[PDB]
Amino acid sequence: MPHAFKPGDLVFAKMKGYPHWPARIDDIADGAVKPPPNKYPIFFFGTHETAFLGPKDLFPYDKSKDKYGKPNKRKGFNEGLWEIQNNPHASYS
């Protein structure tokens, strides 16, 4: 049965106006800005942007990849597909 989300989990993350996007739940570095309550720091693959999202917008990667893991014209998307499949836990600093 599912646990709560934790850092390192892989997802497709949904934001209004964008396709479901390959992403991970990030850690918060020591000294870094924390997310609001009930939000997680989401690192989007490809764009390498962070937004704060709740569970309603996070779709576990294993379950969702057959639906959402397809090329998209949007900037950074296809790079993001490579990153999530091939090195999802790397440093993208």
Side-chain angles (χ1 to χ4, degrees), residues 1-15 17-69 71-72 74 76-93:
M1 282 297 179
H3 295 46
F5 282 115
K6 66 193 180 303
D9 286 345
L10 302 183
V11 294
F12 290 86
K14 185 69 170 66
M15 302 209 68
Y18 302 82
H20 295 79
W21 199 288
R24 68 179 183 205
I25 311 278
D26 250 7
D27 287 290
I28 302 157
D30 277 335
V33 169
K34 296 179 281 184
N38 299 281
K39 310 307 184 66
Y40 290 88
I42 307 301
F43 178 83
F44 288 85
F45 292 116
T47 67
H48 312 140
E49 291 172 16
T50 294
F52 297 131
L53 295 178
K56 71 187 176 66
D57 290 320
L58 305 176
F59 292 80
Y61 175 76
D62 284 338
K63 178 180 204 305
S64 290
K65 63 181 189 283
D66 288 354
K67 191 172 181 178
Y68 293 136
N72 192 283
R74 296 285 251 302
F77 197 91
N78 292 340
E79 187 175 8
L81 299 173
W82 180 93
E83 292 178 349
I84 195 161
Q85 177 165 31
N86 293 299
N87 203 341
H89 301 301
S91 170
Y92 286 98
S93 320

